Structures are given as structure tokens and as C-alpha cells.
């Protein structure tokens, strides 16, 4: 599924992302924008064995098991297929664990490059939620 921006903002707020560990809602909308353009089915194969899955492009070397990735830790304790649903539950649960490491939202390359240090609240402006 490809979300609209305000649709995703509302869903992420219902899924408890606003102010999770200090990160405002716009951070998460911005990260989704630049990782997947709000596409829950996005997948990207990496040069190592791994693949990035779903709306937040969570990687199979570290965070989920797809069975084909050497070095896999499965830190979120899930199959990577769970990250490809129209239901963002599993992606949000895993994202929360990711950001609960000391590296925080720096886990996401797109967030570092396009969101960090900017007015991420622009991504929820004009949304009614």
C-alpha cells in the first residue's frame, strides 16, 4: 500500500510514534517519505546478502530474518515478510526497538541525510489528527 502523507501521519500517531523516546511524529513521517515514499511493499536488495523491507526499509542483516542473509541477528525477532503488510504494526514495533538503541534514528540513512536537523514537523503540517 502507498499511504498519503496525512493518512500515514494519523496511522503513526495511533501506533504511538508521536514523542516516542523524544522523537516527534514528523521524524517518522519524514523517514518514511525518504526511505520508501510511504510504500509498505518497498524492497531493496543490498550488495551484501541483505534486503531492506517495507515503509521504513528495515534491513535483514540486523533486524529481521528472511533466511537468505548471512550474518543475520534478527534483532526484532520477526520474519522480514511481516514488514511488507498494509498494516504498519510490525514495522512500527521494530522501528521502536531500533530507535531504543543509542544510535536512535541514525539507523536510517535517509533520515540522517534528509530529516535530521530540519523542521521535520513540516511533514505533518496541514494534517488534522
Amino acid at each position, epitope marked *: 500500500k502507498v499511504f498519503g502523507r496525512c493518512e500515514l501521519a494519523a496511522a503513526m*500517531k495511533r*501506533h*504511538g510514534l508521536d514523542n516516542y523516546r523524544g522523537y516527534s511524529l514528523g521524524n517518522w513521517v519524514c523517514a518514511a517519505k525518504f526511505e520508501s515514499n510511504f510504500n509498505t511493499q518497498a524492497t531493496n536488495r543490498n550488495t551484501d546478502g541483505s534486503t531492506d523491507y517495507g515503509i521504513l526499509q528495515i534491513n535483514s542483516r540486523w533486524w529481521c530474518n528472511d533466511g537468505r542473509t548471512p550474518g543475520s541477528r534478527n*534483532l526484532c525477532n520477526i520474519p522480514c515478510s511481516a514488514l511488507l503488510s498494509s498494516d504498519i504494526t510490525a514495522s512500527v514495533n521494530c522501528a521502536k*526497538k531500533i530507535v531504543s*538503541d543509542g544510535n536512535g534514528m541514525n539507523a536510517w540513512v535517509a533520515w540522517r541525510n534528509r530529516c535530521k536537523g530540519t523542521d521535520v514537523q513540516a511533514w505533518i503540517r496541514g494534517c488534522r489528527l
Partner: antibody
Amino acid sequence: DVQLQESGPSLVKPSQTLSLTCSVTGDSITSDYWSWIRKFPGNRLEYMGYVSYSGSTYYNPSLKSRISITRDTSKNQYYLDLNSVTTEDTATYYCANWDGDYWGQGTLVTVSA
Amino acid sequence: DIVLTQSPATLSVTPGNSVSLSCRASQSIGNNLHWYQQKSHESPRLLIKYASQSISGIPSRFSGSGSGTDFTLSINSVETEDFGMYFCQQSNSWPYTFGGGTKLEIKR
């Protein structure tokens, strides 16, 4: 099937260090996040801290400067050291994964001379 | 720190009746509220995560609801074996904090 087993002394003298070990099966230490929680006498639970995959630690501010949580993945263990204890540190101590699904059995540690 | 306040302190339940346990947060926590059961001599057992998400193997009679600052654990058709302490815990902000507990006892 992930199993956690706590070990360490049940009696610690005031001003000494309380130390416990959590031994984990089925989940590499560096493949998860790992926590310590304690229950004081009147069902009062305190989340002591956790260590995440990168080795970053989060400690409860109540314990700041007295607590260390460390890891030895080669022994598939992680550790709690709590310095300068007093009778106020008497509690039942638990290790658990950060997700909360897997807990060790609980060990009462009494701080007394 | 976020303070979680549970209600009631004690529930005295007739088996087969349904009950509701409350947990209120001093600051908004979204859905970042988890429920645990603890029997005496046992470790806590996770019942519900993230306010309403089910946990593998937990009986369907346990459910959770709420958001923001107001959360509820519902137990349909309470069984005698449901006797124990029930705690909520928030993970929205560090330090994670627990409610003070609700004791579920059986009426007879």
C-alpha cells in the same frame, strides 16, 4: 526456546557490590536487548536498565553512578553490578529481554550485615 | 519520570464474571503501555503489548484497550487461575516505569 537463568549471591553486606549474572540460551547476547528489573517488598517494581545490541546502556536515573550492565557474548551472559548497596537495595531481582517475553526466575537479594 | 497509577488496588472477583483494570499515565504515552501478570513465586508474564496487541499463547479472554493517558485491561469470564498481581508498564520514555499493581483475588 529462549531461557534465562539468574545466578549470584543472595546476601550482600552494606557498602559492598551486588552482582548478578543472567545466562541466556536460544538468543545470542549481541542479537537482542537485555534488561534488569527489581521488585521491592510492597510489589514496587523498578526498571533498572537495559543494554542494547550496540552496547549502549540506559540506566534508571535513580541508580545513576552506582549501576553497570555489561555483556560477555562468548559466555552468552550479561551482568548486573550495583555498587555501594544499602538495606534499601533488598529486593527480588529479575533479568528479562527488552521485549518482555522472556524472564529469568527471580532471585531475592538481601542487603544486611 | 512518567507515573502510572492503577485502579483498583484490589479486585475481589466471582469466577465467571468479567472485570476491568485501569492504568492512568501522568503524561501521554501513545500506545506504549504493556500489561503483565505476576503470580507469587513466579516471574512476570507479558499479557498485552502496546496497549492492545495480543501475545502468542495468552488466552483470548485477556484484552487491552486505550490510548494517550487512559488504559484498560479486560478479563472476560475470570477463572480462578487468574488470581495474582497485574502491572502496567510504559516504554514511551526513559526511564521505563511501572504502575503500583492491582491484586486480583477470588471471592468465595
